[PDB]
Each structure stands twice: as C-alpha cells, then as structure tokens.
A paper describes a structure:
[name]-[name]-2 utilizes a trimeric [name] for attachment to the host cell receptor angiotensin-converting enzyme 2 ([name]) and for the subsequent cell entry step which involves the fusion of host cell and viral membranes. All emerging variants contain defining mutations within their spike proteins, with multiple mutations clustering within the receptor-binding domain (RBD) impacting both [name] binding and antibody neutralization escape, while mutations within the highly antigenic loops in the N-terminal domain (NTD) across these variants reduce antibody neutralization. Given the rapidly changing mutational and antigenic landscape of the [name]-[name]-2 spike protein, a structural understanding of spike protein mutational effects and the discovery of broadly neutralizing epitopes is of importance.
All mutant spikes exhibited slightly higher affinities for immobilized dimeric Fc-[name] when compared to wild-type. We did not observe major differences in spike protein expression across the variants, and all mutant spikes tested demonstrated marginally enhanced ACE-2 binding potencies relative to wild-type. These complementary assays demonstrate that the totality of mutations within each variant S protein enable slightly enhanced [name] binding, suggesting a contributing factor for the increased infectivity observed for these [name]-[name]-2 variants. These structural findings confirm that mutations outside of the RBD do not modulate the positioning of [name]-contacting residues at the receptor interface via allosteric mechanisms. Our structures of VoC S proteins in complex with [name] demonstrate minimal structural changes in the RBD, reflecting its functional constraints in cell attachment, only permitting mutations that preserve the [name] binding interface.
Numbering used by the authors:
A (entry chain B): 745 to 827, 856 to 892
B (entry chain C): 745 to 793
C (entry chain B): 943 to 1041
D (entry chain C): 992 to 1041
E (entry chain B): 14 to 69, 77 to 145, 153 to 176, 185 to 247, 257 to 298
F (entry chain A): 299 to 620, 641 to 675, 691 to 694
G (entry chain C): 398 to 446
Amino acid sequence: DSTECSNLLLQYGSFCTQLNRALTGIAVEQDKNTQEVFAQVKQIYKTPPIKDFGGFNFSQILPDPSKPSKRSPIEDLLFNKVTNGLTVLPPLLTDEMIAQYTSALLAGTITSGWTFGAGP
Amino acid sequence: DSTECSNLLLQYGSFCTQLNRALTGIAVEQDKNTQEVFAQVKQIYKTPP
Amino acid sequence: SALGKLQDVVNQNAQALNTLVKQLSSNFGAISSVLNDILSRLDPPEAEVQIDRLITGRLQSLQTYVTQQLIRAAEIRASANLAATKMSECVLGQSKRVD
Amino acid sequence: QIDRLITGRLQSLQTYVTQQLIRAAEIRASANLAATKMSECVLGQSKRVD
Amino acid sequence: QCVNLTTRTQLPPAYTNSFTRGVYYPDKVFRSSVLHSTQDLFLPFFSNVTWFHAIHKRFDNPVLPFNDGVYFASTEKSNIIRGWIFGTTLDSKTQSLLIVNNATNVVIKVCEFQFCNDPFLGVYYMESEFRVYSSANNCTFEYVSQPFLNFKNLREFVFKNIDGYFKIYSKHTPINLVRDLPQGFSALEPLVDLPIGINITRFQTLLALHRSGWTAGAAAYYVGYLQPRTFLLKYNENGTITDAVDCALDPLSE
Amino acid sequence: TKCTLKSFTVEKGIYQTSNFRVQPTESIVRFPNITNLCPFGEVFNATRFASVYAWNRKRISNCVADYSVLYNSASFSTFKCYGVSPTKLNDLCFTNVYADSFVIRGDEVRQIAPGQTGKIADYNYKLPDDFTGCVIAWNSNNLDSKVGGNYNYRYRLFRKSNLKPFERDISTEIYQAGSTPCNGVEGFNCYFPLQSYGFQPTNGVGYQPYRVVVLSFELLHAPATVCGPKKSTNLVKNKCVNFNFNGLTGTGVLTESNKKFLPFQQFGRDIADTTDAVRDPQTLEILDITPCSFGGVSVITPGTNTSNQVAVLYQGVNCTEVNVFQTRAGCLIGAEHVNNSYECDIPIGAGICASYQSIIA
Amino acid sequence: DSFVIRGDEVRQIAPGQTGKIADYNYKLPDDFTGCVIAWNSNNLDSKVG
Ligand SMILES: *[C@@H]1O[C@H](CO)[C@@H](O[C@@H]2O[C@H](CO)[C@@H](O)[C@H](O)[C@H]2NC(C)=O)[C@H](O)[C@H]1NC(C)=O
Ligand SMILES: *[C@@H]1O[C@H](CO)[C@@H](O[C@@H]2O[C@H](CO)[C@@H](O)[C@H](O)[C@H]2NC(C)=O)[C@H](O)[C@H]1NC(C)=O
Ligand SMILES: *[C@@H]1O[C@H](CO)[C@@H](O)[C@H](O)[C@H]1NC(C)=O
Ligand SMILES: *[C@@H]1O[C@H](CO)[C@@H](O)[C@H](O)[C@H]1NC(C)=O
Ligand SMILES: *[C@@H]1O[C@H](CO)[C@@H](O)[C@H](O)[C@H]1NC(C)=O
Ligand SMILES: *[C@@H]1O[C@H](CO)[C@@H](O)[C@H](O)[C@H]1NC(C)=O
Ligand SMILES: *[C@@H]1O[C@H](CO)[C@@H](O)[C@H](O)[C@H]1NC(C)=O
Ligand SMILES: *[C@@H]1O[C@H](CO)[C@@H](O)[C@H](O)[C@H]1NC(C)=O
Ligand SMILES: *[C@@H]1O[C@H](CO)[C@@H](O)[C@H](O)[C@H]1NC(C)=O
C-alpha cells in the first residue's frame, strides 16, 4: 500500500504487465490442458441400469450412487490419497464435471467399444 | 572463502537454495532419463554360445 | 508412493509459493525488509535508495518465480499432451504401440 | 563493491541455471522420444511411417 | 558482614549428560502445528554439563564464567537455592546484578555491591541470616516480584544478556528421580526480560545454610553453557513445544 | 477494457482489467494497560523538601511516567522544559529519570537554567549546557514559611570554584577568602559557607520559598524503560482497519479467535511467517487477523460489434464486501443467473460460464 | 532565484538537504536541475554597525 514505492516502481516500466500476462497464459493453459485431456467426447454416455456384462465387474471404476461426489471407489481413493497479492484461480472444470467426463468415457468404452471415438 | 561476502550474501535470502534445488532436480532428471531409456527389461538375456 | 507424480507437482507449486512469500522477509542489502519502517525512519532522499533496493530484490525474485513457473508449465503441458494422446489411443481405441 | 560483485555473479548464475533448465527440458523431450523408440522399434514392430 | 566457610571438603566437580534439556521459547510468538527453524543461543543436546553438589560436607560456590549465556538446572528439595549474582568484577568498582528469593518475594537489584567472598542466606532450626554484600552505593534498577520457586523439584533457568536485555527463562518440573537429570523434553517458558544494560562476564550461585557450625541441605545443581546454533522446534495444536532437533548434532538430525 | 487492451474494439471473452482492494477505514492503536505508574506523589507532594546545597536526587526507573498530570496541573508556576517539548514527553521513552528536589527563593528560580550565573548556579546546583529535561517550580509560602521564621534551608554562599554539572557539595569546611589560615574557626576573612534562608509568610514574591523539582532525562545505550502512557483507541472489529498492537503494525480485519494462546505469547504466525493471530494487550483476548479482501477485477463482454453490455467479476471476493450472483470464482455483477445449462461461451470458472442472448451466467 | 545567506548555509542550497533555510525559507526539489552560485559579499552587503 506504499504510494512512494509504487511511484518508484513505475520507473521500471511494464515488468508487472509482463509477469501478469505470463501468469494469465499459464492459467489459461491449464484449462486448455484439462479440456484437451478430458473433453474429447461431446455425448454424455450412461451405463444401463442392469450391469450384465457377461461376468465382467466394473463396480470399482463406475460411479458409486451412494457417494455424494458421484465418484468411483478408485477415484474416491485417489482423491483421499492426494493432500500478499497471491490469488488462486479456481479451475474451469470442477472435480464432479471431470468425474462426469470420465464416467461418460467409461460408459462409451464399455457399451460401444471404440465405435464412439470414431463416430456414433 | 570471504566471510564478509557471505554475510552480505545472506541478506538476499534463499536464492542459493533455489539454484541448488534446480540443479539437483536436473541431476536426478538425467538419471531418470537413462533409467527410462535403457532399463526397459528386468531380465538380463544372453545369446547362445 | 503410488501417487508421487501428482504429490510432486502439488509440493513443487506450494514450495514455489512459500519461497516467493518468504522472499519478502529479506532486505536485499537494505536496512530493513519492512517498507513502513523505512518510510517512517528515514528521509525520502535515502528512503528512495532503500525502497529501490527492496524493489529490485523483490522484482528479481518475482521474475525468477515466473521463469520456473513457465518451465513447469511447459513440462505439465508436455505431460498433458501425452495424457491426451493416451486417452485418444488407449481408451478410445486399441493401440498396437508396444508399451 | 562486494555487493556489486555479488549481484553480477548472482545474475550470471541465475542465467546459467535458467539456460540449463531449458536445455534439461530439451534433453528430457529427446530422452522421452528415445524411450518411445526403444519401446516401439526395438521391443516390437512399428507400423508408424518414418 | 562476611563470614568465611572453612569446613568444606575438597572434591572435583562432576560431569553428566545434558540429554534433551535446555530448550526455551526463542520468542513471544504463538505458533501452532508447525515446524520452525530458529538460530539462537541454545544448549547442545547430549552435551557435557557440569554437576555440583550440596551435601553433608559439600558446599559448591566456585567462580564460574558466564560467556554467551548460562543454563542452570536445579534438582532441589527443601528450598536451599535462593538466587544468583551477575557481574564482571563482583565489587564496588563495577555494577553488579543481584537476584534473591527470600521468604516473601523475589528481589532483583542492580547496584555496585561490595560482595563477600562467600555470599549466603541462612535458615535457623525462619530466615535470620543474610550475608551477601557489605554496601550498596549506586543503584539503577529495582524489581520486586512474586516468588518464582529424594529430590522432588526440578528448576530450569536460562540466563542470556543481549543488547542490554537480560532474558531469564524458567520451567518448574515435578520429578521423582533420586540423583541425576531425568531424560525427557520440557520447553522453558520465558520468565522475565530485564533492561539492566550492564556488562556480565561472571556469575555466582547463592545458597542457604541450615543452623541448629553450619549444615548444608541436600541439593544439586548443573551448569551448562549456551552456543549459537540452529534448532528445529515442533509446535503442536496447542502452541506448546513438544520436540526439538539439534541441527548440528548428527547427520540424521541434520 | 478498451484502455487495457489498447484497442477500440474488444473481442468476446473475459479480460483481466484491474485490482480491487478494500481501503482501510480506522486506525486501532492498542498498547498495554496503563498500570504501574511512576512514584510522582513522593517527589511533588512531599511533606518536606531538601535544602539547595543538599538537593534530593531520586532515580525513577521501570515504570510509566504520566507527564500530562503534571502539565495540566494549575499548582505549578514554572514548567520550563529545556531540550524537549512537554507535548511529546507523554509519548517518548527514556532510560532513567532524575528527580532533583530543593527549595530556593522567588528571585532565584531563573538561575535554574543552562548558561546562568548566580549563587545557586555556581555554588549550589549547576545544570549542564546540553541539558535535556524540565524545571518545575511552585510557590510554597503556605507550607515552608512560619511566623517565627523558617531557617531549615541552607545554601552554599562561597566556594573557590564553580560546581560541575549535577554535583552535590555537602562539605562544611570553612571558606578561606584570605591568605591567612582559617584553622577551622570562623574569624576574620574566614566564613562558614552554608547560610540559612529566612522564610516568612509576609515576604514578597521574590523572597517567598519556591519548591523546585528538576527532571533530568538522559538516553544511554541501555534499553529505555521509563516510557510515557500509551493512549489506546477503542477496539473495532469486523472491519479492514490499520492495527498497531505493541509496536506491531499492519492492515487487516480483526475477528474473534478460537486459538488458545499460552500466557507469555502475544502474536501468531502461520507457516509463511505472516502475522495472522494476535493477543489484545488491553483485554487478554485472542483476535484473528484476516487480510483485507483483495482480488482481480475482470470484465466479461461479448464483441463490441454485437453489444456494449459488460459484466464484472471480482475474483475471490464475497458479494457482501463490494443482478448480483455469488460464484465460487467470485462475485459477478451485471449478469443474471439462469437455471438452464448451455455450452460454455465465455469461461468464468468453477463450472460457471457466461454468454449473450442481456448477459446470462 | 537571488538571495543573501550566511557562509555556513551555502551547503543547504542543494537537493536532499536537511537544514533551517531549506525548510522555512527556500526548498529545492529532489529532482532539481540547474546550478547554485555563491560568492562572498562582505565588501558590499555588510556594515560596521
Ligand atoms: C462386483 O464387485 C463388487 C465389489 O467387488 C461386489 O460387491 C461385493 O459383494 C459382496 C457380496 O454381495 C460383499 O460381501 C462385498 O462387500 C461387496 N463389495 C463392495 C465393495 O461393496 C459385487 O457383488 C460384484 N458383482 C456384481 C454383480 O455387482
Ligand atoms: C574470606 O576469605 C577471603 C579469601 O581468603 C578473604 O578475602 C581476602 O581478604 C584479605 C584481607 O586481609 C585480602 O588481603 C585478600 O586480597 C582477599 N582475597 C581476595 C581473593 O581478594 C575475605 O576477607 C574473608 N572474609 C573475612 C570476613 O575475613
Ligand atoms: C566431561 O568433561 C570431563 C572433563 O572436562 C571429562 O572427563 C568427561 O569425560 C566429559 N564427559 C563427556 C560425556 O564428554
Ligand atoms: C525480603 O526482601 C525484601 C527486600 O529486601 C524485604 O522487604 C522483605 O522484608 C524480605 N523478607 C524477609 C522475610 O526477609
Ligand atoms: C558511585 O558511587 C560513588 C560513591 O558512592 C560516587 O562517587 C560515584 O559518583 C557514583 N557513580 C555513579 C555513576 O553514580
Ligand atoms: C565487559 O567486560 C570484559 C571483562 O572485564 C571486557 O573485556 C569487555 O570489553 C567488556 N565489554 C563491555 C561492552 O564493556
Ligand atoms: C490440546 O488441547 C486440547 C484441549 O484444548 C486437548 O484435548 C488435547 O489433548 C491437547 N493436545 C496436546 C497434544 O496436548
Ligand atoms: C500534589 O498535590 C496537588 C495539590 O492538591 C494535586 O493536585 C496533585 O494531584 C498531587 N500530585 C502530583 C503528582 O502532583
Ligand atoms: C485493563 O484495564 C481495564 C480497565 O481500565 C480492565 O477492565 C482490564 O481487565 C485490564 N486488563 C488487564 C489485562 O489488566
């Protein structure tokens, strides 16, 4: 909050603009990375209510209805096992939406194989 | 070995720690690179005589 | 140690933030690291010099932090591109690429 | 005078560490490519052209 | 009034292990659930601490250096130890510090005391004997406070003199160990900060005689010297230091 | 946004434009309770004062000296301070205070000053030229004068040389004004140097007894312990104020704290060594110091070809400290929230996106 | 800017000086550009009385 410091800081030019621009580029780059990795399907596929897959069990990777977060047991375990002018911007995609994208990908690859990745 | 220089250098804080940590990260990264490239088999095979 | 890669990224980011905050406590050759103390204890002709020393030290620290942030951003971008490639080729199809 | 020498040498060391980090990133990319070639060309037959 | 004590028994002073004692709070800042690294005048872990006895006929009042700071431990029962003397020449030429704890209150005085060769207090079997100084001409600081105080009581004190401030740190511990220092950790709370502003290079322990000649009550004290070093202190959820690491003791702690 | 991007046309999207900080409103200066006052009752209100040859020197240490009580009194005729002003005495701090007390005549009050000449200055009480302190004098005809004559106050009338500063001469040796030896007997050319003051209640104001107390303030390399009373502003909570607690200053919002401090601890620090908890010195309560709500100001707009309507996002700032909608990303002003879900057009954050159809979020 | 001062006060006609005529008679800014000229005038600006 020092006015004199800011007045002296103005002598150095647009360093602050450069640093803010670089940080903004990194911040948008993280969201672009998340879009590139997870948002590869434009249809939200869902599994059938009856889990008859010929003996194959997918309970550990499909979302759990009992959990409020709508995550899989593996995803829940993964989330449990990971623990002055500075601000932290929230990610554009929240954890539940990323989990929803993974659920859509799992439903597509279980019910349709590789067909959904190449078309209908 | 100048003690006065080190005393003045301590005023600048943990720059030296950051530089050492970066170099240590590069040094372990080189070993990790060699491990990834060459150590792709866990059995040492030999040709027949 | 199964989830070391993500914990490593979280630790690196937190450590960088902690170092950047900690660098404010250094005076960088000035009499004090507190701007209020310099402004209240000295006349503006010498306070300008002390504030200038603090400004150049903090600016060097911030530029250094931004530089490693950009390098880590490049590394994470490469990892994310690899992850997107694995998502496209391993999940959405069957890959003949070995390993 | 010692402060001037310290800031000059510190700037030189920061420049060296920064360029070393950039070269380390380049070498890491090359090593990742080499590991990919080791997995796909040596440990199997690759259908990827060139 | 001064009295020579001529019934002492000649014996060399003993030595023992400091273990993990002598840690004090370095500042007045609350910290919770954190690990803080501080560089200050501390007592090294597992150091060689000098051991003095008071038993009957032992009466250990030697002349000891102060150096950068002094850690004073007391395995005490029945209240023999009463105070300390600080100074450079311990006479009227220079200015000296007096700390006493009589039957009522704790008195701190900074005066040019003409000290006796054997300063002491006395208990008759009530306190009716006080022979510490013969005169007090120039007094600059006075401070009257509350009483600070098998061996049953453990008294830890840390005396430091930096920038004209005399920092006294204290901790009182109930113990039941017969002869030596118990092995454990207890962080010393800061007791008082005094703006005495005097040069201190030598210190004296003040004891109390028991009269029924004289008899010395059973007591033992330990003197250790502080060195500038770094400690890693652990602060719990309640802000109390529960463990410490000497940064220069061994490679594991380093 | 046009000024920031240096263009008259702004494309559709979100642009970081400014920084929002809360301005401090009040100043809170809390120092410890004004207890343990210096014993000024035993100097000023003493039943008897000393003679000027044997002036009492009481040394005052380790307490709080409240000078406004003395300054605002109407009982003092002279309150002349040399080297320091009375207004800042109640703020400044000194290592020791020397209180010299004596009785002189009415006409001799002027001689208690640096650079003066007279019987009192040369032979009784000498002040240095580089003196820092205050000279306080008041009439004491009521107490120090009796109908028979009060001769309980002696002064030194003759000495061979002038006194040094802050010197006391209590010698009763016969002054030798002549070449002949006195031999200890008061005869011719040999006089006793101590002479009594005649104090009657019917005397003039230049001959009436005046009690003089001189306070000497010195600064030595030792830490200064005789400080003035530190005026404490009332505590204001839940607002972004400038706090000064026991010399630790800053700006923050002071709220109630559940942290139980130990009795010797005053301030609180986090991992990053920033002060986030403090103990109020006046009342022993714990206060959390939350930093004032600062954030980025971003302008959400479509293209200027389409519309000129804009919305503002205050990042990481709750809506109550600034079409109002609260998001996890921050407070959004100017965009109406709808319950329908569409594809993301302008990214806001935390799953929230904005579009133009008015601007909806 | 023309004036007459003492002999010891010529050091106070400068940027960044602490002094008496600097504060209450004539103040120079910190970013002052120009020249200060001083010369003795005891023969002209002084009288025996
Ligand atoms: C699929 O796998 C899940 C989990 O491995 C099975 O759920 C278990 O069912 C048994 C018996 O009903 C319980 O004792 C376990 O505690 C269950 N595990 C969990 C994690 O809940 C499930 O039965 C399997 N089969 C089907 C058809 O879903
Ligand atoms: C107690 O013993 C000490 C040490 O023997 C005495 O101190 C000495 O006093 C004599 C006086 O004749 C001095 O000449 C010595 O120089 C002193 N010794 C030192 C080391 O200073 C002390 O006087 C004795 N106490 C009494 C009351 O006699
Ligand atoms: C302590 O010091 C004494 C002599 O100074 C020595 O004999 C003894 O062995 C030392 N003890 C330790 C544990 O170092
Ligand atoms: C303890 O010392 C103080 C100060 O010298 C004195 O006022 C008090 O009476 C003493 N008490 C006893 C029991 O001697
Ligand atoms: C100390 O005391 C002596 C005699 O008691 C006196 O002459 C001397 O001036 C005093 N010094 C100080 C600093 O008070
Ligand atoms: C303190 O006393 C010692 C021994 O008398 C002396 O060497 C040292 O210079 C003194 N220090 C000060 C600051 O007076
Ligand atoms: C901290 O204090 C709480 C009560 O306030 C107590 O329950 C807890 O056991 C304490 N923790 C430690 C480590 O002493
Ligand atoms: C001394 O007496 C006067 C007269 O009653 C009174 O006003 C004052 O408060 C007393 N105390 C001091 C410290 O002056
Ligand atoms: C400070 O004084 C006030 C009254 O002026 C009192 O209510 C409060 O308890 C005191 N605080 C302390 C810590 O003594």
